[PDB]
Amino acid sequence: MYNKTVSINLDSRCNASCDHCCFSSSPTSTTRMEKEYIRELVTEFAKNKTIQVISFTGGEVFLDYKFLKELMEIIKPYEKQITLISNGFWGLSKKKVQEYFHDMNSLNVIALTISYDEYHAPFVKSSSIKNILEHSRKYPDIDISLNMAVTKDKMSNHILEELGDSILGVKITKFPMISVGAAKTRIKQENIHKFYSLEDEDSLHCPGYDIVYHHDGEIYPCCSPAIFETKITLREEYNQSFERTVEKLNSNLLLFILRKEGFKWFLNILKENNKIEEFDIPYEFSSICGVCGSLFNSAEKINYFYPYMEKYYNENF
């Protein structure tokens, strides 16, 4: 269970410095796993019989293209599928776009997501994005998507218009901000959309787990921006196998209760014990992950649930 896909966050370094960035990525970001350690991880994931998809994220994965192509080439003999996400800064040159698409097509890259919005706009020109989107027409086996992070004051309405006909046939999704990283301090909270509240608990369910080996050296149960500020980690030692990561994910009591009972199990404990204000749990949220982030972003918060999770285990199994 949860062992057919894995993600690696290659680095926190990025050419951009978006004001919403969950990692606060910038050209001077230093948080990353060693290159040799990542090589060993990719080699293991490629040799693993159950993994089908390996996803790469950052930071900006195309910043050190030589290392990315080297990692994709370790996977090549094993025939696993690859997904990539990028700010498309490399789209500036049609010749680079041609080179990278040719590489991606021969290295079993099945999906490429390009992020572009008013937060990315100061660092990447619209023309770079257009170049990538137009050339993708020649590679129908690569799934192309455009991810746009928006706020009430920065809805990216003019950005799509300026992309012109390059967006024809491309899946576009506009999404709200998770109040984590640079979004916590550089964006007014009144500009973040509020779709959920502590009251409509019936819809508070985690979308699912997806293992990520993050640039901070930890392992996370999902790839949501919110998880990275939590203390929920699947790593117990420096050299830990994927089998052990999956076994830890599948035997984690907190994640088991979260999957089976939903966020209402944790929220009702805090309401019953009058800890919503003490734990700084927000009243409204842009997404379900926003609740997740605030329930478990400290060791005190997680440890608070232990006697209740212990009682749950005894009662149910």
Binding site: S7, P207, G208, Y209, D210, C222, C223, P225
Partner: peptide
């Protein structure tokens, strides 16, 4: 869904 947001 949100579990594959940054990928």
């Amino acid at each position: 869904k949100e579990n594959r947001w940054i990928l």
